[PDB]
A paper describes a structure:
We also found that the second canonical PY-motif of [name] (‘PPPY’) is preceded with an ‘APSY’-motif, and the two motifs are separated by only three residues with the sequence of ‘552QGP554’ (and these two motifs are defined as ‘PY23’). Interestingly, a Gly553Glu mutation of [name] was found in patients with renal cell carcinoma. We further found that the [name] WW tandem binds to [name] PY23 with a Kd of ~0.78 μM, but much more weakly to the canonical PY1 motif (Kd ~78 μM). We solved the high-resolution crystal structures of [name] WW tandems in complex with PTPN14 PY12, AMOT PY34 and [name] PY23. A residue in the PY-motif linker (R440 in PTPN14, Q282 in AMOT and G553 in LATS) uses its carbonyl group to form a hydrogen-bond with the sidechain of Trp34. Correspondingly, the distances between the two PY motifs of the ligands, measured between the Cα of Tyr in the 1st PY and the Cα of Pro in 2nd PY, are also fixed at ~9.8 Å. The exception is the [name] PY23 motifs with the two Cα atoms separated by ~11.5 Å. In contrast, the two PY-motifs of [name] are separated by three residues (‘QGP’) and [name] binds to the three WW tandems with quite modest affinities. Strikingly, deleting the Gly residue (Gly553) in the three-residue linker of [name] PY23 converted the [name] mutant (‘[name]-Δ553’) into a very strong binder of the [name] WW tandem (Kd ~17 nM), indicating that a two-residue linker between the two PY-motifs is optimal for specific and high affinity binding to the [name], MAGI2 and MAGI3 WW tandems. The weakened binding of the [name]-G553E mutant to [name] WW12 is likely due to more rigid backbone conformation of Glu over the Glycine residue in the WT protein, such that the defined distance between the two PY-motif binding pockets of [name] WW12 can no longer accommodate the [name] PY23 mutant.
Numbering used by the authors:
A (entry chain A): 5 to 127
B (entry chain C): 546 to 564
Amino acid sequence: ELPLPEGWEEARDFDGKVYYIDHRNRTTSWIDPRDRYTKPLTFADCISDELPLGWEEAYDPQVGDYFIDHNTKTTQIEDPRVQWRREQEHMLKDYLVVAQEALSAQKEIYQVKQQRLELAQQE
Amino acid sequence: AEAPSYQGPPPPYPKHLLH
């Protein structure tokens, strides 16, 4: 419920799709000029359902729901919020594996130090 | 299995508003 920045006009397509008119710069964009200030800038900053700036959900009667990335002028069927999710899941899993490996290497060192200490007692 | 191609830019700034 935040107003449009001055010089901006909301408008519609022949198809009814909303877009925005910048009268100061005399240009048009698919991106609501308020998105700057209200939306997450990255998938990381996303909460809940949110899509980051420049992204949009769309429906196609043949193929179903998909995603539009205005930042790179591309489209995809796979949910970008879910690809990001999994990705961060995969990073954590592999990190705990590296951590377990480092810790286990240190376990070997101490056990070896321990045997060598005992061998010195014998001798 | 493929998404529709990227539609493109919105309608151009109104030409009757330029000059």
